[model samples]
Target: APSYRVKRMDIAKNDEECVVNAANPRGLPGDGVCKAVYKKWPESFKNSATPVGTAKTVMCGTYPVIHAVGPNFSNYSESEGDRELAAAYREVAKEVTRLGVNSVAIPLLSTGVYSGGKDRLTQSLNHLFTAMDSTDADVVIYCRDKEWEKKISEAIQMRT
Candidate 1:
C-alpha cells in the first residue's frame, strides 16, 4: 500500500530524520529549494548528484540528506530524458532503505520550472510516493509553498 502523508514545509527546517535533495548533475545545489540544502553544507553538495542512478548521503544538522539527481528537465524532452524522475525517487528509496531511516522528506523533483508543471509535479510525486511507499520509512514531502502543496494534493486527489 502507498502511504501518502505529505507535509507542506521547508526542507531545511523540516523535522524529519532524513531529507532528499533534488539536485543537479553539476554536483551543486545551485538554486531553488535545493539551494537551501547547499546553503547547509556547500562542501557537502559538492560531492555529487550522480552517477544518475546512485545517491550520496551528506550529513546536515542531525539527519542525513540523501542528495539525488532527477532529470534535468531543462535539457530534456518531456518523454525521454525525463525518465530520470523515476530514477530520483527510486534512488532515494534505495538509500533510505539502506540507511534504515525511519522518516524522510522530499520536494517535487524537476517540477516547479525548477520544480513542477501541474502535470509534471503530480507525476513526479506519484513516482516518488510509490517508490518511498515500498519501504518502511515514514515519508514526508516538503513543499516550498501552499500553491505547490495544493496542486500536489489535488493531483493525488488528496485533501490533507
Candidate 2:
C-alpha cells in the first residue's frame, strides 16, 4: 500500500491534493455521493455517464475530481454490481497512477449503491490499493464520519 490514508471528512472537504468521486456508469451526476458533489458544483455534474468499467474527470471547485463510473445502483443485481464496482475502482486507480497524481482522496466506492456489506467495501478498497501500491499517489479513503473510518480501519487491520 503506497500510503493508505483514511480521513473522517466529506470527500469534497478533504484537503488532499486531488479529490475523486464515484460516478454511475454513463457518468450520471445525480445520486448518492455524486449527488452531493453535484449539489455543490453544478458545472461538475456530468450530463451522461460512462460505460461500466470506465472513468471520467470533472473539476469540482479547485480540486480535480476524477468521477469513475460504476455499475448502475438501480439495477437490483448484486451479483453483477460487485464486478462492476471493482472494475470502477480499478479503472480509477489505474488512471491516477497513469496520471501521476501524487495525492488524492477517494470515496468508499459503491457504499451507497448496492448496500454492500463491510466485507465488500474492504474488498473493493483492497482492489484499489493493489493497483496503487506501486505508484507514488498518496490515496486517502474519505469517510462519511468516524463510524465509516472505524470500519475501514478494522478492515485494514485485518488485511494488513
Candidate 3:
C-alpha cells in the first residue's frame, strides 16, 4: 500500500527512513522546510544524483536531507525531447530503495525556481508516482507553501 500524507510537520521524525529533499545534487540546502529540517538534523541525511530524483541529501541533526530532480527542472517535458530527465526520478527512487530506505519524503518538483508550470509538473509527477511498484517504501510529498500544498493535494486527489 502507498502511504498518502503531507510531507511537512515533524511526523515520522525518528521513524523516517530518510528525508528526501526536492533538490539538486549540489547538496546546498534551499530555503524551505527542508532547510529548516536540515538545520536541525544533519546526520541521517543522504544526498546523491541516484536517489529520490534530483534532490540532494544531508543531515541536520539525526534526520536525512534528500534532494531530488524532477522532469521539469531537469528540462524534461512530458512532450518532446528524450525522457532522460523523467527517467532520472524513477531511477532515483529505485536507488533509494536499494539503500534500505523504506520511507522517503518529497516535495513538489519544478514548481519553484525551475518553474515548469502546473500541467507539465503534474504530468511528470503522476508518471513517476504511478510507475512505482514497491509497497514496502512509503513516499511522502510535502508542501511548504499553501498554494503549492493545495495544488499537490488537488493533483493527488484527482489522480489517486
Candidate 4:
C-alpha cells in the first residue's frame, strides 16, 4: 500500500529522518532546495556531483540527505525527460530502503527551474508512489506552493 502524503511546507523544516533534495546534475549547492539544504547542512555538499537520474547520500546532522538529480528538460526529449525524472525517484527510494529510513521528506523534483511541466510532474508521481512498495517509510512530500499540492493530490487520484 502507498504510504505517502503531500503537504505544504518547507522541506528544510520537516523534521524527518531523511530528506530528498532536488539537485542539479553537478549536485552543487545552487538554488531552491539545494541551496536550502546547503544552508542547513553544509557538509552535504562535500559528497560531490550526482548525475542526472541518480542519487547519493550524505549525513547531515542526525539524518541522511539523499541528493537526487532530475534531468534538465532542455537537454532531453519529453519522453526521455519523464523517464529520467521517474528514475530519480526510484533511486531515492532505493537509497531510503537501503538506509532503513522510516520517515522521509521530499520536494517536487525538476519542477522549479528545471523546466518540468505540470503533466510531467503528474507522471512522475507514479514513480514516487511506487517508492512505498520497497520501503517502509511514510513519505511526506513538501510542496512550497498550493498548485503543486493540488497537482500531487490530483495525480494520486488518477493513480488510484
lDDT of the candidates, in the order given: 0.71, 0.68, 0.54, 0.80
Q: Give one digit per residue, the lDDT tens place, for model 3 in 37-121.
A: 5555545344434332443444455445555555434464545312544555565566566566777765545566555544444
Clashing pairs in 1: 111-115, 111-116, 112-115, 112-116
Count clashing pairs, candidate 2: 4
Model 4 Cα lDDT, one tens digit per residue, 1-160:
4366788877888878889988877768898778888888788778658899998898876679899898888787888988888888899988998999778998867777786444456666667776555788888888878787988877666756
lDDT of 1 by residue, 1-160 (tens): 3345667766887767787887776676577777888786566664665755456787655568888877656666767545767877888888888888778878877776643334576677778766876898767677867787777767656523
Candidate of highest lDDT? 4
- TM-score-best of 1 and 3: 1
Give all TM-scores, in the order shown. 0.82, 0.78, 0.63, 0.88
Distance from true position, residue 82, model 3, in Å? 8.1
